[PDB]
Symmetry: C5
Subunit: 313 residues, 5 copies
Amino acid sequence: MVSPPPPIADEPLTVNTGIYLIECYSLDDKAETFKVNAFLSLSWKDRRLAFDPVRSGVRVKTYEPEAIWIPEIRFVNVENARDADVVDISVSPDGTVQYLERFSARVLSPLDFRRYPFDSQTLHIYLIVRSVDTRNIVLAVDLEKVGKNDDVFLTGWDIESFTAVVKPANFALEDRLESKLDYQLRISRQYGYFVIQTYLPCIMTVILSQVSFWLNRESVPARTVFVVTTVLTMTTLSISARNSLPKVAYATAMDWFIAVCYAFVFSALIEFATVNYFTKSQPARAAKIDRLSRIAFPLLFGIFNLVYWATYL
Amino acid sequence: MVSPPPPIADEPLTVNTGIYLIECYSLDDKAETFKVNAFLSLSWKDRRLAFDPVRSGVRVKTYEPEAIWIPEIRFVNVENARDADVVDISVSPDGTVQYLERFSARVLSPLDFRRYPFDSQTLHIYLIVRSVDTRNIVLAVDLEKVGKNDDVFLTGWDIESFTAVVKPANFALEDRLESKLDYQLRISRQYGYFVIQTYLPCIMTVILSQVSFWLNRESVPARTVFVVTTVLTMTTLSISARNSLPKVAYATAMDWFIAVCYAFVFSALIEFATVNYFTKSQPARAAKIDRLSRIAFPLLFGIFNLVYWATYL
Amino acid sequence: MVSPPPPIADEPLTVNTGIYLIECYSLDDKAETFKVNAFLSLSWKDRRLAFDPVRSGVRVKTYEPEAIWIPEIRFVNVENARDADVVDISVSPDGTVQYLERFSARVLSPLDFRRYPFDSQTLHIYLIVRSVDTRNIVLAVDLEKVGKNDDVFLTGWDIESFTAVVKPANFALEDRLESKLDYQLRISRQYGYFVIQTYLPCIMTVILSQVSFWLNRESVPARTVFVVTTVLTMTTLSISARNSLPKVAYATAMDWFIAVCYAFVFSALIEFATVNYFTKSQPARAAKIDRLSRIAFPLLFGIFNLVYWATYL
Amino acid sequence: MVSPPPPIADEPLTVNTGIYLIECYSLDDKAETFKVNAFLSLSWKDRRLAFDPVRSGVRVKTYEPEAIWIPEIRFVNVENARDADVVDISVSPDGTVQYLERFSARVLSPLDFRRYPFDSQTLHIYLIVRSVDTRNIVLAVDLEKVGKNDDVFLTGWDIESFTAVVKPANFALEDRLESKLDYQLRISRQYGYFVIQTYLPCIMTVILSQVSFWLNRESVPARTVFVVTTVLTMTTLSISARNSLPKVAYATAMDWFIAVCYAFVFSALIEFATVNYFTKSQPARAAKIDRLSRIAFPLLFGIFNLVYWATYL
Amino acid sequence: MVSPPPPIADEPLTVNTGIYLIECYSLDDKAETFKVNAFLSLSWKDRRLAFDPVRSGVRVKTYEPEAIWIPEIRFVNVENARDADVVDISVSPDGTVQYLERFSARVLSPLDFRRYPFDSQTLHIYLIVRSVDTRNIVLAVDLEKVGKNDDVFLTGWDIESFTAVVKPANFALEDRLESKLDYQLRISRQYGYFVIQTYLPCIMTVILSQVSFWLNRESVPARTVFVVTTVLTMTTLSISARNSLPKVAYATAMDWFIAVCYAFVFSALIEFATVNYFTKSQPARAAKIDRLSRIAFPLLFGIFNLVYWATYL
Ligand SMILES: CC(C)CCC[C@@H](C)[C@H]1CC[C@H]2[C@@H]3CC=C4C[C@@H](OC(=O)CCC(=O)O)CC[C@]4(C)[C@H]3CC[C@]12C
Ligand SMILES: CC(C)CCC[C@@H](C)[C@H]1CC[C@H]2[C@@H]3CC=C4C[C@@H](OC(=O)CCC(=O)O)CC[C@]4(C)[C@H]3CC[C@]12C
Ligand SMILES: CC(C)CCC[C@@H](C)[C@H]1CC[C@H]2[C@@H]3CC=C4C[C@@H](OC(=O)CCC(=O)O)CC[C@]4(C)[C@H]3CC[C@]12C
Ligand SMILES: CC(C)CCC[C@@H](C)[C@H]1CC[C@H]2[C@@H]3CC=C4C[C@@H](OC(=O)CCC(=O)O)CC[C@]4(C)[C@H]3CC[C@]12C
Ligand SMILES: CC(C)CCC[C@@H](C)[C@H]1CC[C@H]2[C@@H]3CC=C4C[C@@H](OC(=O)CCC(=O)O)CC[C@]4(C)[C@H]3CC[C@]12C
Ligand SMILES: CCCCCCCCCCCC
Ligand SMILES: CCCCCCCCCCCC
Ligand SMILES: CCCCCCCCCCCC
Ligand SMILES: CCCCCCCCCCCC
Ligand SMILES: CCCCCCCCCCCC
Ligand SMILES: CCCCCCCCCCCC
Ligand SMILES: CCCCCCCCCCCC
Ligand SMILES: CCCCCCCCCCCC
Ligand SMILES: [Cl-]
Ligand SMILES: [Cl-]
Ligand SMILES: [Cl-]
Ligand SMILES: [Cl-]
Ligand SMILES: [Cl-]
Ligand SMILES: [Cl-]
Ligand SMILES: [Cl-]
């Protein structure tokens, strides 16, 4: 068929849209994608479908999608076209069509890892419709039809809210008007997992590097094992940790924590080398170095942790 | 076709549901998903299809899905719509339709890892139907049609039971009634694998750390190698072990066992450092520290293992 | 159409089945699945399709699948419904339908890892048919139509035979009679790969641990390096090896070999600790301990290897 | 239908093409593939579809793809045929068809890793059409119809431009004329990630190897630990780094940096072995070797880094 | 439709086949599969479709696949049925059909790793056609229609040739004649990648093991670190390397190189143990052992590399 002609002859047809989240899963940090399963509801007026509720013995009447004109509604930030099962189509005597489908889709939405793993994100789902030559078509948001099931979970996140920006973006694209709505799922990451995956190994590796200051300065190999293994451990943890993220250009909050831990451990190595350098000549100097280090290192590290955890929580 | 009109004019149409598990596989702890292949049986009354059992020499008669109205039944907590092959449709003389399909689906159901790897789970499969404008449709459970084949296996688990909650959850959603049933597969994990994957490496690594107390106090590098490699091994096992799980915030029972093992090993490091601190001056104190440690450590560790394994078995 | 009515009025229709393996691949030990690509041949009698071979100038005549009744044949132990292309349908003058399709499927079959990697398996392909309300349907095996192409290979396995159990298993399921056939692909694993993936690292790691008995007792750190690295290597090989298998409860033959190797290595550690414990006081005892160990350890290890490889080969 | 006959009887029909990038994701360096989601626009002349704009009260008129002849346009460097949803088909009074589809595809395009990770690439998308027996078909580029949305991102790259080579490549293939267009997405890699993934571990590992020159020459085990672990670390980092790339024959810029770092580290090992060789006999020589090394190594390494980072930036 | 009747009443219908490779990708050594995107061209004679070239003013005329009989051509060694888009079907006045499709497929073809990574392979694509009851059908090869695009690449390989074995294998299968063609893609591996992935780490690890002979015999821990870490490095490199291949029974050329390197490294270990054994008593003997070893080991290793690289290049 063709689109409903305008009664005002010059009026845009608006399609009232709503999304109801049923299932939300597979939030992939590295791919910056997530999978969503929801209701899509569309509503518009096609007076061609009007009918007498009495002559037609039905209060509503229901159609197959093949029977009537339906707006071509597409998702933008999706990998493939969604998979949809039309659920219901109900017309009113005045021509008001209420369309309901259930869809699943792989949404592509970029993440801001700067504050990671203390990050919040806005996942976006962009709806769009392209105007035909006979009529311009415009999207709108029916707030009654937006929401999400209570049993919606992302197994590592707190889900804040699912809302829609009511005023759409209308613009020209290849000589036709396109109309775009922005559905926004706000989430904030649950960082605790990482505390025992990365932060604790880091803190313990720093402490372990500091244990070397209490070993006798003459047992040089022992202190060597301490200093060297803690340096290699920091390097391994650093690489491992950045392996969870996409190849982002910037540095994360975890990056800063790991880099400072690497600073403390490598400084313990430099301290061991200096102390070893002054042990025969000027043993008083070496002894003073260890005496001060045993207090300074764990103090600067404690203060650092205070500023860090105070800041990012 | 169209939905069966009510005889009582105000009676909800109930559809009797049953699921019979044929194959159960791919229980993914990290994805919190599993795959199921089963019979779905639905049964309802459409008097329009009734017929005289004597005038018609046939006892049942069978239709194709296109011939008669069939209720649209959806799964809720699933990733894509199921793949189903209709098996049979048999109408009764009184108008009772018995529908049978075989379907496969990827179900998404969250797991409770707090007690892991000594955990039990309830996998859920939610059936749902949305009411039409002409009639409300309500789900119910035919126990004769619920079960699972005996040769059904989840390799890492014991399958306890497959049952259904008979009273459905009926509620309003986007201005129509939905009726939702909760099918429940109860399972409990087989922990033995993990005993030799993680628990043994941990217990042996704690013992290894304790061997250092019997080495000569003067051979500082040897004891250093013992202490340091056991600390790094504990960390490695911690990270490795948590890699099996989704990014849950909390701690598993395995987490507690590993954390206490880390406590014993790091305590062995602190002991080595203390003994080394007193080896030249006050060799009696250092010697006594080794003497007590050699009894306390394996004893406290044995007691801990006793309380832990007594608790979680 | 409808199912072929019985000539004896009470006789079950048997469907003669055959499978011809064309391609066999992706035998996944962890997933307990494999992929199969084969011919499925069915043959039954439908008198309605008989015809005069002389009046009709054709010796066979061929139908389209939509033209005639075809039995619904399903695989049981499969993940999704198979993918099939109907190849040919030939009716005989008497009504004998010979149906031929080519299908691919992902078969789900449990593996018995107890004797692994010296294990044999039976991969199963269960065919099944459900009786309709008009007639009971029963499966049988046409031996002429069972076999496999010679260039069928499972890269890690020797394929012994592909045969079928002629008598089917008939049983009641949800108030109808079902008929189930068991096609059996027998395979036996080629263990050589594992000899150089796991068995050699283990044997050499044990030997390496035994070299420590020949090092000077006064050079404590050297012997520490030997003993400790060999223990951690054994643990690493153990975890690595068990990562190839599903989360089975039991122990494999490889588990036993690795565990005994771990016994030898940890025993060498305990020996080094005893010798070190007796080195200052009672150097004769320490020396005697090493003297005996250098003969006992590699001797008991050789004997063990003799029993092990004699048993599992 | 059939293809439009030529007005000149011997004139090729040109199809004006355009691509508008909507989504660009999953650029896999190892697979040398990327995924694209875009508009494909085609435009050509079919006089059979011309019409009087006055007798027909419509200014454009729109057809279904089944109604009119549409040119078969294929992508060359793609894995499967694209997935396309026809969006709009608009005929003009003169017979000018404006066709618009939205497609997703997995494009296969080779990468030049010689300058990696400081590399720029040209991803190619080849359009092609095969001439029919009735008429030759030739592709062209409608610049109005080429572009890309501003929010297009490759989460690891800077996107320079998306342009088309206007002149197509015409050639004979299996006795017919083919016409091929080259759409080119120019991108350049964001190397910063790799600086902290590989370049820093390498630089620090070289520095660590240099610390050994400041340890007392008599503490041979300590220096052994430094030298040996830094060499093995270089090897591990090399293997890890080359694991991100396809099995390319040549060497990348990163290969060179890692190889020079390996030169410096192995040179420190060779230095330690030489120093240890001369420590008893000719200790002045050994002392001088350390004296010069402490100045030369970090100087040659700093100079090298200066030349390298100056060159590849 | 039906198959073309024979003019000779007893003549087999031949189908002239050709494949033109467009895209060749994803050669998976472990899966022994590769993906191909190509033209499939078929050509046969159906007199029923003939026409007068003069009365009919048309030189060819074109049909839709539904209009005429088309032979069912299947690939044998493929995982799923191919995905094909029919491109063109052109009949000649005499009745010669020229059919052209573009298909993609996942081909399964076994590899011979004995000479790896210096291996050449023949990837096979088997075409096959099954005879119908009315006529025997036989495959043949049209060389004009066989080839590959010049920009066809398998990263990590040299593509030698794509040819066909002209004489097909005709044989009986389940009581009908099948006709099978062997298309052969010859390739040879580019080993250079492996040179820097495995061969260099091995060679340098052997050299590193030899450095121990130049360290002072009294620094037992130092030599212990050398010998032990190099032995474990060899084991790790071995396991890593074999992880790239399927679970083949035999040994590759790379296996032999790695095994000889392990021999040299373990022999250096045995030498260190022997030298350490004779260091107190008979220092002349130990000294002589190091003196000879420092020349023999690197010499025998140089000769070995000479024979090996001379052989496999
Ligand atoms: C100039 C003389 C007198 C002193 C020579 C010693 C310096 C060369 C050392 C001392 C502290 C070292 C720094 C300690 C910490 C780091 C953090 C490290 O960053 C990371 O590891 C990033 C990890 C991540 O991003 O997750 C980079 C090297 C750097 C700057 C080191 C550079 C070399 C430094 C300056
Ligand atoms: C000055 C000397 C005398 C005492 C200083 C030593 C303390 C700082 C040590 C003693 C016990 C240690 C604790 C022992 C065990 C743990 C558990 C450990 O947790 C895990 O490894 C988690 C593993 C998992 O969850 O899988 C984190 C470090 C911690 C808190 C250690 C923190 C540092 C502690 C308090
Ligand atoms: C003689 C006294 C003074 C000191 C020894 C204390 C014992 C408690 C030690 C000595 C030998 C140890 C055993 C050495 C070998 C192993 C094999 C180990 O099994 C595995 O590693 C499983 C590997 C796999 O299954 O893949 C389990 C611990 C166990 C029994 C150890 C348990 C603790 C033992 C008995
Ligand atoms: C003269 C004697 C007394 C001692 C020196 C023996 C040589 C044989 C050493 C000195 C420098 C070494 C080279 C140092 C650096 C390299 C680059 C190295 O390349 C890499 O491993 C980088 C990894 C990558 O390419 O990604 C390969 C070994 C090699 C050629 C080494 C080969 C062995 C060499 C030539
Ligand atoms: C005091 C003297 C007589 C030595 C006594 C110890 C022997 C038992 C050692 C010395 C040399 C060793 C051999 C040195 C090298 C190897 C190669 C090794 O092969 C591999 O690692 C294969 C790796 C791969 O296939 O990739 C198998 C063990 C073996 C034969 C060793 C077996 C044990 C041997 C004979
Ligand atoms: C994270 C940086 C640590 C810096 C610690 C400086 C300690 C100075 C000790 C000097 C002793 C003479
Ligand atoms: C909310 C959990 C934070 C855990 C980290 C607390 C900071 C510990 C610092 C230890 C420094 C020695
Ligand atoms: C869970 C915490 C375990 C810590 C063990 C402490 C042992 C102290 C022994 C004191 C002997 C001197
Ligand atoms: C199936 C139960 C396995 C539990 C194993 C407990 C072993 C405790 C060892 C403690 C050694 C100190
Ligand atoms: C795996 C069991 C090894 C047992 C070796 C016994 C050696 C006894 C040596 C003690 C002599 C006093
Ligand atoms: C990349 C190669 C490093 C070469 C450094 C040589 C240093 C000179 C040592 C002088 C010894 C007396
Ligand atoms: C192919 C196996 C190589 C083994 C190398 C042994 C070299 C022996 C040298 C002994 C010198 C006394
Ligand atoms: C084609 C490149 C082959 C590389 C062979 C390197 C051989 C080095 C042997 C060194 C022996 C000491
Ligand atoms: Cl969509
Ligand atoms: Cl020492
Ligand atoms: Cl569903
Ligand atoms: Cl099936
Ligand atoms: Cl395409
Ligand atoms: Cl095929
Ligand atoms: Cl050491």
